[PDB]
Structure formats: C-alpha cells, structure tokens
Assembly symmetry: D2
Homo-oligomer: 106 residues x 4
C-alpha cells in the first residue's frame, strides 16, 4: 500500500481497538497496524517530496515509524497475555507518536 | 532515593529539557531521569502498600518503568547525535507514560 | 522483495558492516537491513507454508523480526553518534537473533 | 548491591532459567535479573575506575545495561504469555549482551 492508505489502516484499527471486547481482537488489529507501519517505513511524505532520501528530515521521518512499531510490538504482548484493558490503553498512548509525526511532516 | 524524590527528579529534569539550549544539557537531564526511573523500579506505591510484591498490579506498576526507561534510552540517543529539537519532543512524549501510570496508581 | 532476497540483503550488509571504515557506511547498511527486515515481516517461510496466518508459529515467526528491527534501530543510533566500533559490535550481536530464527523455521 | 553481587544475581538466575520447569519460575528469575541490571546501571567498573562519569566509555558502559534490561523486559512478556520454551531461549540469547560488555570492560 501507499502512505495514505497505510495511514487509514492504522487509524481504522486504532478505532477497532477502542471498541474491542476481547483480547484476540486487539491482537489482530495490533498486528495489522504493525504491518501498515512497516510498509510506511519506506515512503516519502509530500512535505519532503523535494528532499533527498538521505536528509536528516527523512531519517527523523523513518525514526518515527521505528518508535511506532516498537510500541505496537509491546502492546501486542499485553494483548497476548489476556490483559485487554492495558493493551487498549497502550494503543491509546500511540496517539502521542502519531501526533508528533503529523505535527512535523503532515 | 525514595519514590517521591525519584518522581521530583523526573519532573525537574523534564522541566530542564523543555527550556534547554544545547544537546549536552538534554543528555545529562535524560541520563539523570534514567537513573531516577531505575531507582523507582523496586518501590511499592502507597496505593498498593497493602498489596503483595507478586500482584498483577505490582507487575503492571513495574512494567510502566520498563517502558519509561526504554523511552529515555532512545531520547538520549537523539541527544547524542546533536538532534536537540527531536530529543526535546521525545522528552515531551514521555508525559503520556507518566500520566498513564499516575492515573492507575497515584 | 521476496524472503530469500531479503535474507541475502541482511547477510550482505552485515558483511559490509564487518569490513567498514567509517560511521556513514555502517548507517547506510544498517538502514538497508532495517528495510529488508520490514519487508520480511509479512512473508510465510516454506517450513510453515502449510500452516495458517494465525498459528502460534507464525506469530513467533513475526515476533523474531520485531526483535531484529528494534536491534537495528538501536545500532543505527550508535552509527549516527559516530561510535563506529560499538555499532559494528551491535551488528555482530544481531547474529544471535538471526540464528535463533533459522534454528526454528529455516 | 554492588556490581559484582549484581553480576552474580544475573548469573544465578540465568542458571535458574535454564533448568526451569514452568513459566512462573522464569518470570520471577527474569524480574530479579531486571532489578539487578537496574542496580548495576550506576556502578563504575574497576577497568574505568580512573575514568570520569562523563567519558564515552562510561556512556557505552551504561548503554550495555540499557540493552540488557530491554531484552529482559521482552523475555518476561514471553514468560507471561505461557511460552516457556521461547522465554528460555530469549534468556540464552542474553549472553550475547553479557559477553559483549565483558569483552570491553571486564
Ligand atoms: C497510530 C498512528 C497514526 C495514525 C492513526 C495516523 C493516521 C493518519 C491519518 C488518518 C492520515 C491522513 C491521510 C491523508 O493524507 O489522506 C495520516 C496522514 C499522515 N501521517 Fe499518520 N497516523 C499515524 C502515525 C504516523 C506516523 C508515526 C508518521 C510519521 C512518522 C505519520 C505520518 C503521516 C503523514 C506524513 C501523513 C500525510 C500523508 C499524506 O498526506 O501524503 N503518521 N495519518
Ligand atoms: C516523566 C515521568 C514521570 C513524572 C514527571 C512523574 C511525576 C510525578 C510527580 C510530580 C509525582 C508527585 C510528587 C509528590 O508531590 O509527592 C508523582 C507521583 C507518583 N508517580 Fe510519577 N511521574 C512519572 C512517571 C511515573 C511512572 C512511570 C509511574 C509508575 C509506573 C509513576 C508512579 C507514580 C506514583 C505511584 C506516584 C505517587 C507517589 C506518592 O504518592 O508518594 N510515575 N509522579
Ligand atoms: C541478520 C539477520 C539474518 C541473516 C543474516 C539471515 C540470513 C539468512 C540467510 C543467508 C538465509 C539463506 C538464503 C538462501 O540461500 O536461500 C536465510 C534464510 C532464512 N531466514 Fe534468515 N537471516 C536473518 C534473520 C532471520 C530472522 C529474524 C528470521 C525469522 C524471524 C529468519 C528466517 C529465515 C528463514 C525462514 C529462512 C529460510 C528461507 C527459505 O528457505 O527460503 N531469518 N536467512
Ligand atoms: C546476563 C548477563 C550477565 C551475566 C550473567 C554476567 C555475569 C557476570 C559475572 C559472573 C561476573 C564476575 C564478577 C566478579 O568480578 O567477581 C561479571 C562481571 C562483570 N560484568 Fe557481567 N554479566 C552480565 C552482563 C554484563 C553487562 C551487560 C555488563 C556491562 C554493560 C557487565 C559488566 C561486567 C563487569 C564490568 C564485570 C566485572 C566486575 C568487577 O570485576 O568489578 N556484565 N559478570
Ligand atoms: Zn505498500
Ligand atoms: Zn477507513
Ligand atoms: Zn494475531
Ligand atoms: Zn512491555
Ligand atoms: Zn533509592
Ligand atoms: Zn552524559
Ligand atoms: Zn530511536
Ligand atoms: Zn517484497
Ligand atoms: Zn542514512
Ligand atoms: Zn541504545
Ligand atoms: Zn545496589
Ligand atoms: Zn551465586
Ligand atoms: Zn513475577
Ligand atoms: Zn517482543
């Protein structure tokens, strides 16, 4: 997928995570978000469409996804040990990373 | 140090990080926060003073610091590669972890 | 790319990292490995070609790359702060993760 | 505790993890190792007893424990989701970090 449709996947599964009932559902959504994030890693955002692959802006852009994946990874562990409530909270806490990247490059 | 004084160290160095000018200063403050966090790992918070070392609440309490240290660790790398602005932002993004723990156990 | 060619990229850049001279070269190789790893995340290995997307084997398979990317992510920070020698060592220490996965699913 | 007796705790619990039978036992040992590692964070190793708190050697020394804790943290999650065998393997995979630090500063 491309950046935008990777972003919609993150956003739609985050939504699924909010209104989830059991652990299994959070894990699946988390997994999908992890894949989306992985796929976004290699994209160039319009705001830096001019700028080169090797610019400090693109390194920092790629870094944001590094953070995001690590966060999803951990949240998924919480899902896998049955701890639904804290998984959902960890998912909520992702927004701090989403917004940080948007603010700079969106 | 004790829990409370560990907490004040985190809070005071976070404040130092906000109003910092160069990379070196952020790194030092970050380092101090990392130490404070490490020290807090083993404390029992008043709200769980009743509860045992092995309760799922104390595991989740200890887990919060595991998150926090990892976050500081990464933010410090940013400080060490001269990237002041993004280090400061990563420091701000810690607040999501602070508040998450306060909410449950403070 | 496909799994095999993703694997050769990891292996060839690891080799580049061994015999590197400056920081910039390690960072580039590390970046490439990170991308390769991200790409591998979604593959099904022949040994589990029978088994479903949702099997505990495929979860543990995906988990191995989650580890690997996090490790590359940190090693790259070391590359970015000029610390060549320790970056190279962190790269060598990846082999423990490579071999762990091979052992089970290769 | 001091460095040496922190090191014996890591080593004795690693031993406990090898010869463990159930998940609960691995988790406890892992927890103890996490605490030991946290406690070691602030020590000065004899080989750098001369050198200052702020030397690049002491930063790299402290970094090694950052890596180690993150690794234990993840291994403990595996313990907490009942996956004994892979927890034990993750514990084994710690040795790559132990040895890396010994080699440079022991
Ligand atoms: C769970 C985390 C996140 C969610 C839910 C999320 C959600 C979204 C949504 C809904 C959009 C609008 C897409 C459009 O322009 O049509 C978007 C755009 C974007 N996001 Fe995210 N996002 C997340 C994380 C991130 C991160 C970590 C980065 C960068 C490191 C990032 C960079 C962007 C960029 C650059 C755009 C603009 C895409 C474009 O217009 O071409 N986002 N995001
Ligand atoms: C940058 C991160 C954090 C900051 C700035 C912070 C700050 C503080 C502050 C200012 C207090 C109140 C001090 C007082 O007047 O007594 C406090 C209390 C507390 N914090 Fe944090 N905190 C952070 C992270 C955490 C985390 C991760 C946890 C748990 C995992 C935690 C658990 C607590 C608890 C339990 C108290 C209550 C202590 C008491 O009542 O004596 N905090 N924190
Ligand atoms: C630096 C890290 C790694 C390196 C250098 C590496 C290297 C390789 C190499 C050289 C091959 C054989 C290529 C061929 O002749 O077909 C291979 C195959 C494989 N690797 Fe890795 N690998 C790494 C990490 C991983 C990880 C983390 C996993 C799983 C989570 C994994 C799973 C596999 C599998 C399943 C195969 C078999 C592919 C096939 O038979 O087509 N590897 N790897
Ligand atoms: C699970 C991981 C590890 C185990 C099992 C382990 C085990 C040990 C043991 C058994 C000793 C001998 C203590 C003595 O001198 O009497 C030791 C020493 C030492 N270890 Fe570790 N170690 C680990 C990780 C680390 C790490 C990550 C570092 C540094 C980043 C480190 C630094 C040292 C140092 C500096 C000494 C020498 C202490 C001294 O002589 O004053 N070790 N370790
Ligand atoms: Zn795509
Ligand atoms: Zn949608
Ligand atoms: Zn799943
Ligand atoms: Zn965790
Ligand atoms: Zn204390
Ligand atoms: Zn420093
Ligand atoms: Zn980072
Ligand atoms: Zn591909
Ligand atoms: Zn680069
Ligand atoms: Zn690091
Ligand atoms: Zn001590
Ligand atoms: Zn002993
Ligand atoms: Zn326990
Ligand atoms: Zn994990």
């Amino acid at each position: 997928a491309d950046l935008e449709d990777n972003m919609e996947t993150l956003n739609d599964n985050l939504k699924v995570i909010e209104k989830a009932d059991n652990a299994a559902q959070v894990e699946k959504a988390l997994e999908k978000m992890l894949a989306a994030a992985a796929d976004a890693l290699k994209a160039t955002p319009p705001k830096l469409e001019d700028k080169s692959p090797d610019s400090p802006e693109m390194h920092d852009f790629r870094h944001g996804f590094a953070i995001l994946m690590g966060q999803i990874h951990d949240a998924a562990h919480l899902a896998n040990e049955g701890k639904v409530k804290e998984a959902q909270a960890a998912a909520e806490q992702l927004k701090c990373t989403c917004n940080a990247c948007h603010q700079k490059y969106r």
